[PDB]
Short mmCIF file of C-alpha atoms and ligand atoms in Angstrom, two decimals:
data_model
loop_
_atom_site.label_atom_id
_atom_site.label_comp_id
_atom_site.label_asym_id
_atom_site.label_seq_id
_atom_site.Cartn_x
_atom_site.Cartn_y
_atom_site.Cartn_z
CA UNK A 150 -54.58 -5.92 2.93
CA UNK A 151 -56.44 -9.02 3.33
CA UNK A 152 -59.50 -10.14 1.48
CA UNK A 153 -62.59 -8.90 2.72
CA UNK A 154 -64.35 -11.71 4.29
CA UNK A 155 -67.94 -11.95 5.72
CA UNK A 156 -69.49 -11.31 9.57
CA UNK A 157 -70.22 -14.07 12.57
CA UNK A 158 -73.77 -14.98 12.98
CA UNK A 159 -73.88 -14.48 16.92
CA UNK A 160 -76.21 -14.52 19.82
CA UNK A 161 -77.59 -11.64 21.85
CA UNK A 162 -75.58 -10.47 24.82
CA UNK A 163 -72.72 -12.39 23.14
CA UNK A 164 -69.13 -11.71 22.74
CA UNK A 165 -68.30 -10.26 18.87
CA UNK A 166 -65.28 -12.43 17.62
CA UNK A 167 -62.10 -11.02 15.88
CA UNK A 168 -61.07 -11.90 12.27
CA UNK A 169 -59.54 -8.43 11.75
CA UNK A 170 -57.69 -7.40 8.77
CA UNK A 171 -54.41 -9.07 8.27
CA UNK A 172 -51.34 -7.75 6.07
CA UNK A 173 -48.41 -8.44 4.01
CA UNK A 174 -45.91 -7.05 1.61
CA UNK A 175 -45.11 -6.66 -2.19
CA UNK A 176 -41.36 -5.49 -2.59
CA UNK A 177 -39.57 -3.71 -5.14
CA UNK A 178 -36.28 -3.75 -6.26
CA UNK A 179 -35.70 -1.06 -8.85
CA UNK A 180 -32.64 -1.25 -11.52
CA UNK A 181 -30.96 1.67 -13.02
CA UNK A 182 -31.67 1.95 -17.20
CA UNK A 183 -28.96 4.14 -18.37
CA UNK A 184 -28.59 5.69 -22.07
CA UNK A 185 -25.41 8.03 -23.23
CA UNK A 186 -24.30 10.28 -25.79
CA UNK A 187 -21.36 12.09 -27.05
CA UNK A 188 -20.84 15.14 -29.84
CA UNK A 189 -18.31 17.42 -30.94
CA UNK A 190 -18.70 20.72 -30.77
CA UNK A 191 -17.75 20.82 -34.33
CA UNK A 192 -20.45 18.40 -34.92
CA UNK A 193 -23.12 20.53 -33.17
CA UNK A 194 -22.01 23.87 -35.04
CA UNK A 195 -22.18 21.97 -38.69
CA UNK A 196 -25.00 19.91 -38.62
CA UNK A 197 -28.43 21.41 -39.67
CA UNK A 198 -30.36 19.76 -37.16
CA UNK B 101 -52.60 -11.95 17.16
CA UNK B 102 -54.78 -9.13 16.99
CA UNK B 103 -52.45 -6.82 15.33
CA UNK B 104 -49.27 -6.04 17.02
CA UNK B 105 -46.06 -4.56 15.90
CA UNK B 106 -43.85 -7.92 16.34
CA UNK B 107 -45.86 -9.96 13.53
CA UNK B 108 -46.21 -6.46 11.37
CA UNK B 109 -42.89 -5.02 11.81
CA UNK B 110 -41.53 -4.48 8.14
CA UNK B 111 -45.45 -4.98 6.72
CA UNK B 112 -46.93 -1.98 8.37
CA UNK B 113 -44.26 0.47 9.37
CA UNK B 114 -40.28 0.86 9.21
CA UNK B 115 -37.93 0.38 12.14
CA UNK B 116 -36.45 3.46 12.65
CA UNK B 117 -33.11 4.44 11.85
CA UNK B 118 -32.18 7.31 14.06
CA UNK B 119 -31.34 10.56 11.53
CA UNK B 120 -28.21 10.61 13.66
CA UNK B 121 -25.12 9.10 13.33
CA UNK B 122 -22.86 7.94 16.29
CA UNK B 123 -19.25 8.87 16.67
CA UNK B 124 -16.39 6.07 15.77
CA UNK B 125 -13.18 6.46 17.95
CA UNK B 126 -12.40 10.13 18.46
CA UNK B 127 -8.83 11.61 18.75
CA UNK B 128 -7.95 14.26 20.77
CA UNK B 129 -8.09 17.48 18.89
CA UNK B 130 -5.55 19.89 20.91
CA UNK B 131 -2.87 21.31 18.32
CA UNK B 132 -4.65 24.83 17.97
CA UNK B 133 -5.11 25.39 22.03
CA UNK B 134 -2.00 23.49 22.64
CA UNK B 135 0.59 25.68 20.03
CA UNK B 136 0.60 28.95 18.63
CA UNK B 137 -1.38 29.22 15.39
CA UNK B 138 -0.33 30.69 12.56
CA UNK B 139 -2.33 31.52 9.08
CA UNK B 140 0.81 31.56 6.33
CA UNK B 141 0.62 33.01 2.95
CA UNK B 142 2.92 30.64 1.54
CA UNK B 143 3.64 26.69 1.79
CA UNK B 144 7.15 27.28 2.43
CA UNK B 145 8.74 30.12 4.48
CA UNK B 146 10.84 31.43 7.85
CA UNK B 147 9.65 32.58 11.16
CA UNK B 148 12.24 35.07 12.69
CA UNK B 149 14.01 34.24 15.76
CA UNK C 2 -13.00 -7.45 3.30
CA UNK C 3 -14.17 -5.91 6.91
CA UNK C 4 -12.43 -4.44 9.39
CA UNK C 5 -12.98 -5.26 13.59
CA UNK C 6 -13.35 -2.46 15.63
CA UNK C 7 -14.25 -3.50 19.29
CA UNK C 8 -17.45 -5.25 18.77
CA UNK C 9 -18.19 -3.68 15.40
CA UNK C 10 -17.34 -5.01 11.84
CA UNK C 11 -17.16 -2.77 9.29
CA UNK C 12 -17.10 -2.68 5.58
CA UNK C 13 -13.91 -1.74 3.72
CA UNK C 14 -14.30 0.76 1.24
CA UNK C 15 -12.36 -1.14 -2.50
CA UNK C 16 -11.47 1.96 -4.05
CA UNK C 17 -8.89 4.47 -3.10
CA UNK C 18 -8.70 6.35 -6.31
CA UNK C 19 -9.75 5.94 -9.91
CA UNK C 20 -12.37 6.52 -11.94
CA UNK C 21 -12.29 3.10 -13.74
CA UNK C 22 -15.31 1.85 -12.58
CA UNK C 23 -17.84 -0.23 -15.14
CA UNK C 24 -21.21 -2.07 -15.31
CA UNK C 25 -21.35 -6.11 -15.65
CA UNK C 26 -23.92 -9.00 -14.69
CA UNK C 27 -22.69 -11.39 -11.93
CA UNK C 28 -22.42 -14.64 -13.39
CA UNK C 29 -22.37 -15.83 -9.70
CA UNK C 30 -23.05 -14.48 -6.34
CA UNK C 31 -19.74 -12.02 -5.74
CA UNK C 32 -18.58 -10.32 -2.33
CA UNK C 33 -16.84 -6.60 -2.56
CA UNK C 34 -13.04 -6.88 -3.27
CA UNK C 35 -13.22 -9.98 -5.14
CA UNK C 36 -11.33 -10.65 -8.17
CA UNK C 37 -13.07 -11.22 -11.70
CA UNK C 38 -13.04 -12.02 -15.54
CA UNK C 39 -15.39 -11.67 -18.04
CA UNK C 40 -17.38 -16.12 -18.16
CA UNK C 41 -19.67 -13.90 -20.77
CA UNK C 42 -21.11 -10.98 -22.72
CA UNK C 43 -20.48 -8.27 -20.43
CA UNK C 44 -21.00 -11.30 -17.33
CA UNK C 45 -18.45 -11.63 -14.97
CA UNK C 46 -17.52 -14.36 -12.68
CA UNK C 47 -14.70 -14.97 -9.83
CA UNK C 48 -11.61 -15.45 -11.10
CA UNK C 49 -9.00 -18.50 -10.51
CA UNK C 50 -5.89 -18.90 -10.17
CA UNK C 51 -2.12 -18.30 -12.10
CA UNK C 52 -3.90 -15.48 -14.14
CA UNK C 53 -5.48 -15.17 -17.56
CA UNK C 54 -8.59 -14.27 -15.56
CA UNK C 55 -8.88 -10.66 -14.62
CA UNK C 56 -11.02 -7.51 -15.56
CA UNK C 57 -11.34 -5.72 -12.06
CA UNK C 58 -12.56 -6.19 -8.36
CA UNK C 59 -16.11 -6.37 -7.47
CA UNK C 60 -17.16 -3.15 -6.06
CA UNK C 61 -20.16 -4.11 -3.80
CA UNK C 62 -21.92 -7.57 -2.91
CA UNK C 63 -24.24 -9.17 -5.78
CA UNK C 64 -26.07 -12.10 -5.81
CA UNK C 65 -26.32 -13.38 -9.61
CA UNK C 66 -27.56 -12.28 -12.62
CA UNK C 67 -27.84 -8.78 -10.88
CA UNK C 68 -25.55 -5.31 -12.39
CA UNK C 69 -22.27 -5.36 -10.97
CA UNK C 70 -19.65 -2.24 -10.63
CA UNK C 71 -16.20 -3.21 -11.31
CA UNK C 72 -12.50 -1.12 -10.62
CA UNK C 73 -10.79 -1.81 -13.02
CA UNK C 74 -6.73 -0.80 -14.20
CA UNK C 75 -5.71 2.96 -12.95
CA UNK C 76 -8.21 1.76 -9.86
CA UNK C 77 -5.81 2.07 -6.58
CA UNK C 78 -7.70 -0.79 -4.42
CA UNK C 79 -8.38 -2.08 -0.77
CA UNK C 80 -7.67 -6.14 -1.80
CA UNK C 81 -7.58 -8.89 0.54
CA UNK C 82 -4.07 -11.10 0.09
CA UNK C 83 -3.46 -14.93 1.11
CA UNK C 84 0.13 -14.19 1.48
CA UNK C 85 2.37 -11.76 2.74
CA UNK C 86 2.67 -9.02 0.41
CA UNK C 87 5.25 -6.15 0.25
CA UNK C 88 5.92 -2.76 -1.45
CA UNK C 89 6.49 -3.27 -5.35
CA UNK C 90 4.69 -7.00 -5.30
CA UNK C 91 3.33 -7.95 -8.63
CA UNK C 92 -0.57 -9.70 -7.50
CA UNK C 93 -2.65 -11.03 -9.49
CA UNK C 94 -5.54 -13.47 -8.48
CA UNK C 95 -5.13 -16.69 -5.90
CA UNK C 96 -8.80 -18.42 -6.97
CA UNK C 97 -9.78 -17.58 -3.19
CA UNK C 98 -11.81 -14.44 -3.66
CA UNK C 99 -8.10 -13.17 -2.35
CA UNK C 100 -4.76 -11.98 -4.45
CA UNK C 101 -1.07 -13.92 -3.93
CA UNK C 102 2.00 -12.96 -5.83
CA UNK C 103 3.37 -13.62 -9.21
CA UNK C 104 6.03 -15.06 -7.60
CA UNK C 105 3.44 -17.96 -5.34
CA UNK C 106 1.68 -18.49 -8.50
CA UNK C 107 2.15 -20.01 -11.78
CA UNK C 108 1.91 -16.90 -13.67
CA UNK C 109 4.87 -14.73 -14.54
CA UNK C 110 3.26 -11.66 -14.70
CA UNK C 111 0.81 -9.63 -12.49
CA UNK C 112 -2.30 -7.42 -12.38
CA UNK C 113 -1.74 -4.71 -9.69
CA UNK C 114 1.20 -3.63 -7.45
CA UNK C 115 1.21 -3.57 -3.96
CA UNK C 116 1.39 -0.13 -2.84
CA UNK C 117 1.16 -0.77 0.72
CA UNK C 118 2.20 -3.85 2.15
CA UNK C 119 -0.07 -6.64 4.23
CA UNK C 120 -0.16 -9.95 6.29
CA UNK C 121 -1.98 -13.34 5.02
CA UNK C 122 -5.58 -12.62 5.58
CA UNK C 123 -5.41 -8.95 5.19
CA UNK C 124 -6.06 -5.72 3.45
CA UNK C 125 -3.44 -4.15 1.12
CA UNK C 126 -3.47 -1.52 -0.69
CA UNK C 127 -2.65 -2.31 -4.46
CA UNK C 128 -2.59 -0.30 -8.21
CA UNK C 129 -4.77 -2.24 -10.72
CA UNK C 130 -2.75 -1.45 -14.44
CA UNK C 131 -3.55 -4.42 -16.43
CA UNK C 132 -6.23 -7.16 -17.51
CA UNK C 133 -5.41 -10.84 -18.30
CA UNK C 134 -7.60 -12.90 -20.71
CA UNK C 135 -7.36 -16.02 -22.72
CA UNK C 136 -4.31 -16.20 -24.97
CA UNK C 137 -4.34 -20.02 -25.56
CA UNK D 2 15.78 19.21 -18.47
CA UNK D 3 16.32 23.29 -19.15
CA UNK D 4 16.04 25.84 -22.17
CA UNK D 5 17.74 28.34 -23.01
CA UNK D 6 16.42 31.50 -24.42
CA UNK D 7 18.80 34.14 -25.14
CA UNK D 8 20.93 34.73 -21.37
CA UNK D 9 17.79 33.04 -20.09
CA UNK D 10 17.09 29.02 -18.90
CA UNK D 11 13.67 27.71 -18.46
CA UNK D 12 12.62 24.24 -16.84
CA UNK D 13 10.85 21.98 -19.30
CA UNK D 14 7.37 20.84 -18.12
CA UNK D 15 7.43 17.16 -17.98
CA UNK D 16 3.84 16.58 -17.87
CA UNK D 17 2.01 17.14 -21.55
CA UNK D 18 -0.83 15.55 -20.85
CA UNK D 19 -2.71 12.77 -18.53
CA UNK D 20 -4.24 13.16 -14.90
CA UNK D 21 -3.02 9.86 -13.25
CA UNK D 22 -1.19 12.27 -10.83
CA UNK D 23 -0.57 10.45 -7.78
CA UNK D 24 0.80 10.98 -4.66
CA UNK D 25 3.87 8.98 -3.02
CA UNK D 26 6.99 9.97 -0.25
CA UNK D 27 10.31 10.45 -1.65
CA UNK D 28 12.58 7.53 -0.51
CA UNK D 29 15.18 9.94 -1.80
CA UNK D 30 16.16 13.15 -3.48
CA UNK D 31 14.33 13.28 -6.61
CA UNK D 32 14.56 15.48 -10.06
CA UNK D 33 12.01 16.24 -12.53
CA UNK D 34 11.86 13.65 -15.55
CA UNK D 35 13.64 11.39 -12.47
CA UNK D 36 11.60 7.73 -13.06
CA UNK D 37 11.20 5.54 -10.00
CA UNK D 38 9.65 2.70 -8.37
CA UNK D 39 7.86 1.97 -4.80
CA UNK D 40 11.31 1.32 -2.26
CA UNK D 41 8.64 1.36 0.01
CA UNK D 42 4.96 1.66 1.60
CA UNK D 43 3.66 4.70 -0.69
CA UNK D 44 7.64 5.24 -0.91
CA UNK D 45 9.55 5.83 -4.45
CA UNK D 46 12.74 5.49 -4.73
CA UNK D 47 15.00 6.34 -8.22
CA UNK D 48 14.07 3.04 -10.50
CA UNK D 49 17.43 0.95 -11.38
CA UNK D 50 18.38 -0.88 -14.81
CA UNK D 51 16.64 -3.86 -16.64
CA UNK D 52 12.87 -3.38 -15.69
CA UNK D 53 10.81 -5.10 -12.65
CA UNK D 54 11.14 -0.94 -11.90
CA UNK D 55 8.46 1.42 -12.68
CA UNK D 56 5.95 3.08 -11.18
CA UNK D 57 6.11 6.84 -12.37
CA UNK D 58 8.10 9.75 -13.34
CA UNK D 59 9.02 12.42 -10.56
CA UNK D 60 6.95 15.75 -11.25
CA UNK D 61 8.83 18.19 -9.85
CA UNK D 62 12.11 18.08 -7.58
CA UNK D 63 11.86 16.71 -3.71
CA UNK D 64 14.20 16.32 -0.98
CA UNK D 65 13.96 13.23 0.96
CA UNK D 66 10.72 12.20 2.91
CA UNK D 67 8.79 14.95 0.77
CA UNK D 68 5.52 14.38 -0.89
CA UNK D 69 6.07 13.69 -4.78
CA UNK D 70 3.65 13.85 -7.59
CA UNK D 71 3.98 10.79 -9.67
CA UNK D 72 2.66 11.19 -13.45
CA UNK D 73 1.69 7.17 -13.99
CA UNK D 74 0.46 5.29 -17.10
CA UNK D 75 -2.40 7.44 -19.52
CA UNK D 76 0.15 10.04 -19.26
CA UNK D 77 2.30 11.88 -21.79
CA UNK D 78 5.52 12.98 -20.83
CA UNK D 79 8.80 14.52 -21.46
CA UNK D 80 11.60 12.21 -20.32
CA UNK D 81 15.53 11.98 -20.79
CA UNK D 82 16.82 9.28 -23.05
CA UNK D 83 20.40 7.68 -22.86
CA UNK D 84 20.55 7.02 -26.44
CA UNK D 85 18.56 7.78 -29.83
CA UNK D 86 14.61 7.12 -29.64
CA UNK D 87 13.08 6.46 -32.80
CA UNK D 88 9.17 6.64 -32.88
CA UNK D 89 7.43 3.20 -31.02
CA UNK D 90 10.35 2.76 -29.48
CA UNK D 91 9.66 0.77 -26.43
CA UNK D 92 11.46 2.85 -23.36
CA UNK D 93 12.25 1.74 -19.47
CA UNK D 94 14.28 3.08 -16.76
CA UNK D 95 18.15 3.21 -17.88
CA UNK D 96 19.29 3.65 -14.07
CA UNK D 97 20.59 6.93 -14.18
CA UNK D 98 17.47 8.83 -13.50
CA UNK D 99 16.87 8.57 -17.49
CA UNK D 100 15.34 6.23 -20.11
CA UNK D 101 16.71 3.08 -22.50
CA UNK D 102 15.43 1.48 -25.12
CA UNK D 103 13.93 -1.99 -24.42
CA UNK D 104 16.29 -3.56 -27.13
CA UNK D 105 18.83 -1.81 -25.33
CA UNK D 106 18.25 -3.27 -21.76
CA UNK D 107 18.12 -6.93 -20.57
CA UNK D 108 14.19 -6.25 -20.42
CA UNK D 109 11.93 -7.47 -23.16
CA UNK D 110 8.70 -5.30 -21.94
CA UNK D 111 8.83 -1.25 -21.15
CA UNK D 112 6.83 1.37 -19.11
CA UNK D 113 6.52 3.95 -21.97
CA UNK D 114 6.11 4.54 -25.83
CA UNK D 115 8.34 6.75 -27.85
CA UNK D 116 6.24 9.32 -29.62
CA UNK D 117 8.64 12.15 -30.54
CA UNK D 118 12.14 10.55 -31.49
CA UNK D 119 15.37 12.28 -29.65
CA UNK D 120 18.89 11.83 -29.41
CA UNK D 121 21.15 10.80 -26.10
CA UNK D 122 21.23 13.30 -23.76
CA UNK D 123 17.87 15.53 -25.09
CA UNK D 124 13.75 15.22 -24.48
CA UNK D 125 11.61 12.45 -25.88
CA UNK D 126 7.87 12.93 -26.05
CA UNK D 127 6.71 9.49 -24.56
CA UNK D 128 3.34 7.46 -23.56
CA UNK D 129 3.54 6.18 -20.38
CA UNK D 130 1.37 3.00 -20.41
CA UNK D 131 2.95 0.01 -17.87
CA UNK D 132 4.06 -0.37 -14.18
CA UNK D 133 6.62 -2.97 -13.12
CA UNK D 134 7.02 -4.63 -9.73
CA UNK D 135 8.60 -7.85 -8.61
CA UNK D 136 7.69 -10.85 -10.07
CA UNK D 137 10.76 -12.84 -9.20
CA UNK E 2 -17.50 -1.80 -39.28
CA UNK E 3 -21.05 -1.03 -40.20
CA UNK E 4 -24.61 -1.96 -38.26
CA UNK E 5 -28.30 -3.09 -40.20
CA UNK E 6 -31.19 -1.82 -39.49
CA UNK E 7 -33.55 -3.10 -42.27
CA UNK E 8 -32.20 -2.36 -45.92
CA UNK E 9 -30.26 0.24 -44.00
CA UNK E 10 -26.18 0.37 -43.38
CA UNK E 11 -25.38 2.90 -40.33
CA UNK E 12 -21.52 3.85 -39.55
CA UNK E 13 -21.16 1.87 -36.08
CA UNK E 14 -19.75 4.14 -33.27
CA UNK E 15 -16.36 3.23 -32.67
CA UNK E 16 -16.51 4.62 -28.85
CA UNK E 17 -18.78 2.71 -26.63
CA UNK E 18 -17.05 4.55 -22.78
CA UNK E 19 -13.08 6.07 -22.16
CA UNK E 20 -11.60 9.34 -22.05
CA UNK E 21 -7.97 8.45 -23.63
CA UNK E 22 -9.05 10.52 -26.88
CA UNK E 23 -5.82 11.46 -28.31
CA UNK E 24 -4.38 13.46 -31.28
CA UNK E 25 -1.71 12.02 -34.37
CA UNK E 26 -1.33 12.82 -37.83
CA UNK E 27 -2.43 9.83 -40.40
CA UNK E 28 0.80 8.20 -42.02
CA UNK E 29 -1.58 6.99 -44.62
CA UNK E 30 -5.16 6.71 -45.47
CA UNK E 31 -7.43 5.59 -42.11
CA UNK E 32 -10.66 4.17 -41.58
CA UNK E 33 -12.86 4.05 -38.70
CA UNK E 34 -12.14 1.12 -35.91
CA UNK E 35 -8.74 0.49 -37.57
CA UNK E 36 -6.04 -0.35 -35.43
CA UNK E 37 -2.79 1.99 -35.60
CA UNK E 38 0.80 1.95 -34.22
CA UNK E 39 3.34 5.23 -34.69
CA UNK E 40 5.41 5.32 -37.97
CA UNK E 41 7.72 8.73 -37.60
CA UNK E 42 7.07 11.75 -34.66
CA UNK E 43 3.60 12.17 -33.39
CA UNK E 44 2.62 10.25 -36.91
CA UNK E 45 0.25 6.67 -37.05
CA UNK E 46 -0.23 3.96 -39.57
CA UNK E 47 -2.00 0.87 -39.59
CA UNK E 48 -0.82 -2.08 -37.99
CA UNK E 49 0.56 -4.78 -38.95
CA UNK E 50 0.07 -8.39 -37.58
CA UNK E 51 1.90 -10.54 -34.77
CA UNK E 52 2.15 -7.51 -32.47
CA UNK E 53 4.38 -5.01 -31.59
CA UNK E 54 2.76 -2.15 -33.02
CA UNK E 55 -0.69 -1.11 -31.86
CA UNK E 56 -1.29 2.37 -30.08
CA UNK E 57 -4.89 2.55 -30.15
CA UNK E 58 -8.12 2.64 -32.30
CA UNK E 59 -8.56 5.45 -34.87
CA UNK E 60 -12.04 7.31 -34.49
CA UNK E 61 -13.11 8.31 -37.94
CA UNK E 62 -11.92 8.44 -41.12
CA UNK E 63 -8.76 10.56 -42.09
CA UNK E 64 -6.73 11.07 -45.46
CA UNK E 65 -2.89 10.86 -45.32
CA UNK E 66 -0.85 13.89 -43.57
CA UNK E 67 -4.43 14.78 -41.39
CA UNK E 68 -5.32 15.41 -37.79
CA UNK E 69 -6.82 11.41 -36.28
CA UNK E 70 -8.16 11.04 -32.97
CA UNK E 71 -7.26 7.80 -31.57
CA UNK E 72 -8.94 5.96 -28.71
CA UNK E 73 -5.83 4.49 -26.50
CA UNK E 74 -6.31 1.86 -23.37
CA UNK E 75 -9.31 2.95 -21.02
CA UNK E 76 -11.33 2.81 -23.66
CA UNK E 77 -14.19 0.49 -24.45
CA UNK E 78 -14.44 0.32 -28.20
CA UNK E 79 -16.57 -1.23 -30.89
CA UNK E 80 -14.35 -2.89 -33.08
CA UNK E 81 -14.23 -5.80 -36.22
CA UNK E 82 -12.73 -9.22 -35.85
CA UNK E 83 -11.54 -11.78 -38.82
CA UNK E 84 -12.52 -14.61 -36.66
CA UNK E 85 -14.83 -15.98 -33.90
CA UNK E 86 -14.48 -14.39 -30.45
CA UNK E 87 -15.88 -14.97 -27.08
CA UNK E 88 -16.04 -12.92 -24.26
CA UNK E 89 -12.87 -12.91 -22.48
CA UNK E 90 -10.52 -13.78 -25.39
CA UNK E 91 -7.40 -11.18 -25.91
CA UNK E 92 -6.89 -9.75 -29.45
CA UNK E 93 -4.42 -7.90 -31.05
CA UNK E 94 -4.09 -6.19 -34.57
CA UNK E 95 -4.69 -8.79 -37.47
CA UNK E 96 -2.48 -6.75 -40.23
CA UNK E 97 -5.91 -6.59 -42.39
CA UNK E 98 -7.74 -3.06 -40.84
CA UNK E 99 -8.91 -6.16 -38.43
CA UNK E 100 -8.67 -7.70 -34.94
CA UNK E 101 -7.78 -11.31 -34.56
CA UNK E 102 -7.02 -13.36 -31.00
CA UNK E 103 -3.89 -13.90 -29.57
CA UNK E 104 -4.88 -17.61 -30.01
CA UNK E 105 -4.27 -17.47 -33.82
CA UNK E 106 -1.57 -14.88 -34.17
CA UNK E 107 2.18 -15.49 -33.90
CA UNK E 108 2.31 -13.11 -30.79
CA UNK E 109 1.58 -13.77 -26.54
CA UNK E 110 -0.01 -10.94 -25.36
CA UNK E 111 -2.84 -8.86 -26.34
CA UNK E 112 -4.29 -5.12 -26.41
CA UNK E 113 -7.85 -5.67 -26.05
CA UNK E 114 -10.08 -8.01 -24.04
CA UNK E 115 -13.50 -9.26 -25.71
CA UNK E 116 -16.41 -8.34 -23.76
CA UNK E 117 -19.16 -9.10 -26.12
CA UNK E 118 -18.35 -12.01 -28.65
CA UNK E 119 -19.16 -11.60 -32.36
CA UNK E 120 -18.62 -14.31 -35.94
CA UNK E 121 -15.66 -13.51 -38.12
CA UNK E 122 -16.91 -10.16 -40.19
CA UNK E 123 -18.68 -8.66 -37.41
CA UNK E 124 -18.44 -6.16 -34.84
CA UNK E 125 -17.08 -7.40 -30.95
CA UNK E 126 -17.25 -5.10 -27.95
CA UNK E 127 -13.78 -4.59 -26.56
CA UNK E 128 -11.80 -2.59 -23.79
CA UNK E 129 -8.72 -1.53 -25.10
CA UNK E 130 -6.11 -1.52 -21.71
CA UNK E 131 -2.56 -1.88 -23.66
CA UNK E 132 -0.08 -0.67 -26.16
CA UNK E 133 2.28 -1.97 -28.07
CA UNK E 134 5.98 -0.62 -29.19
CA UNK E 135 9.20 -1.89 -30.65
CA UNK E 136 11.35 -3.43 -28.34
CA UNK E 137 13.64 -5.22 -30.99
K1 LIG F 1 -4.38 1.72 -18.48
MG1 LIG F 2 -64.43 -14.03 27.27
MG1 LIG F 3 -60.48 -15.24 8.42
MG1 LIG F 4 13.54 29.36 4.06
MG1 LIG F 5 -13.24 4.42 -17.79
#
C-alpha cells in the first residue's frame, strides 16, 4: 500500500475528492540451497556415534 | 484511475490460469472397437486357426 | 529449440534419457539446448566452435549469474543442428547456440552421436558421451 | 557365448553390471555379445573393423526389425575376443561380431577396457566406456 | 589431499556427486584421491604419467592384495594437482599420486575436466568422464 496521506479541507454541500489508496509490488525470486551426504552401511554399524 | 483491474492487474490479484488443460491434436483411438481384443499371458505366442 | 504447431510454439523438451544432469552459474544469458563449457568455477558459458569447449546442454533458459541445469555425457538430447545431420554423425559444437559435424568443423573428434537424423535448422536427436576442455 | 555343465549348456549373461540399457531396432539379425553401431535412425546394425563403429553390445538375440537392448558405456560386460586380452587392454569391434585389440586394428582409440584377460575365441570381462560415429 | 580448518587437518572427501562406484583389488599400497589404471585381472595400481593408464579415482585407503572402491567417469571428484589449474583445463594422471594438465604432460587427451581451479599442492574439483587403456 501507499503512504497514508492527510484529508481535503472542503466546503459544505461540496463534492469529497479522491486520493484513494494506490498499490504496487515487491517480488521474490527464491533459489534452491541444497546440502548432501553419503555413508556406508559399514560406516553406520561401526561408528559409536 | 480510481482503482481498476487494468492498472492493478499483477499488483492486486493474479490472472487466472484455468485448472484445466486443453487438448493438443488428438488421434483417433479405434483399435479396441475396431479388432478383436485379446489379453495374452505371454509376449510371444500362436492363435489357432 | 521450439516446435510450430498451427499457431502455437512450443518448447522442446532437451532430454530424452539420462540422469546426468548438474548445477552451474550462467556466465551469460543461455537459451535451453545450447551448448556449454565451463569460462569458471563451476560457471558456464556458450561454447564456440571446432571443440575444446563442451560440458553439456543448457537445460532451461537463464539469464546470468543465475543456477543453471546441465545434461551432460550418457544424456540422450533434443539439439538443434546448422547442418544436415545423419545416423552415426559425430557433433560437437558450431559457436551458434547449434551443433555441426566433426567432419564441417575443425575438430577431429566429437561430443555426441546423432541418433536420429535432422535438416539445417532443426531438432535431432543425439547421445552426449564425452566432454572437451583445454589441452593446449 | 555358452557353458557347459556336465550334458548341460548355459548362455553366459553378457551384462555384469551398468544400467545404460538402451533401446534401438535391429538393422539385422543380432547375437548376444554381438557389438554394433547406428546403420540407421535408432537402427544398429553389426559394427565393422577399424573403429568410427560403436555404439553398444547386443543384449540378447533379435531377428531383424526387433527391438534390441543395447548395454552402452558405464557398463561391464562379457564380450568375445579374436585374440589374447591382457588386462587395460584397449578393445574395439574386430568385425566379426567380436572384439580386437586397439594395437591390433588400424584404430588408435577403443570402445571398451579389458578387465579380465582371455584368450581368442573365450569371454573377456570388459568396461565399456566410448561410442564412435563418423568423423570423416 | 587434506582440508584446514584452524590448527586442524580433516581427510577431504574424495566424492563430491556420481554413482560409477566400482570394486578392484589394490596391486600395491593406495591412498585416497590417487589415480589408478589395471595391472593383472580385476587388479589396480597407480598410474603412471603421459597417459594411457587411468581407470578411475581410488576412494580410501587400501593395503596391497585388498578390496578398493574406485570412482570411474560420471563422477565428480575432489582431487590434488602438481600444478596450477583453471576451470576448464583437462588433466590426466601426473605419475606422482597427482593430477597434472594435459598442457604439461607428454599426452593429448585427458580424463578429467577442472571445474573449480586450485595452486599446485592443493585440492581442484573435477568430473572424471574418461578412461584410459593400452592401445600399443
Ligand atoms: K561416461
Ligand atoms: Mg462533479
Ligand atoms: Mg496523493
Ligand atoms: Mg510361435
Ligand atoms: Mg551424475
Amino acid at each position: 500500500a501507499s503512504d497514508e496521506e492527510f484529508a481535503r479541507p472542503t466546503g459544505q454541500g461540496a463534492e469529497i475528492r479522491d486520493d484513494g489508496e494506490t498499490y504496487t509490488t515487491v517480488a521474490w525470486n527464491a533459489t534452491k540451497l541444497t546440502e548432501g551426504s553419503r555413508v556406508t552401511d559399514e560406516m553406520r554399524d561401526q561408528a559409536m556415534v | 484511475f480510481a482503482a481498476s483491474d487494468p492498472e492493478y492487474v499483477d499488483t492486486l490479484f493474479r490472472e487466472q490460469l484455468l485448472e484445466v488443460v486443453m487438448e493438443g491434436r488428438e488421434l483417433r483411438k479405434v483399435a479396441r472397437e475396431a479388432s478383436n481384443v485379446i489379453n495374452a499371458n505371454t509376449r510371444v505366442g500362436d492363435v489357432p486357426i | 529449440a521450439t516446435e510450430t504447431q498451427g499457431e502455437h510454439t512450443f518448447p522442446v523438451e532437451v532430454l530424452i534419457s539420462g540422469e546426468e544432469l548438474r548445477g552451474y552459474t550462467a556466465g551469460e544469458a543461455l537459451s535451453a539446448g545450447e551448448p556449454v563449457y565451463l569460462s569458471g568455477d563451476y560457471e558456464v558459458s556458450a561454447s564456440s566452435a571446432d571443440g575444446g569447449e563442451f560440458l553439456g546442454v543448457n537445460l532451461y533458459d537463464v539469464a546470468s549469474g543465475e543456477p543453471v541445469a546441465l545434461a551432460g555425457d550418457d544424456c540422450e538430447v533434443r539439439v538443434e543442428v546448422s547442418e544436415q545431420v545423419t545416423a552415426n554423425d559425430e557433433i560437437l559444437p558450431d559457436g551458434l547456440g547449434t551443433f555441426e559435424t566433426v567432419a564441417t568443423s575443425a575438430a577431429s573428434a566429437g561430443v555426441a552421436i546423432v541418433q536420429e537424423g535432422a535438416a539445417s535448422g532443426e531438432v535431432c536427436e543425439a547421445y552426449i558421451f564425452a566432454v572437451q576442455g583445454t589441452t593446449a
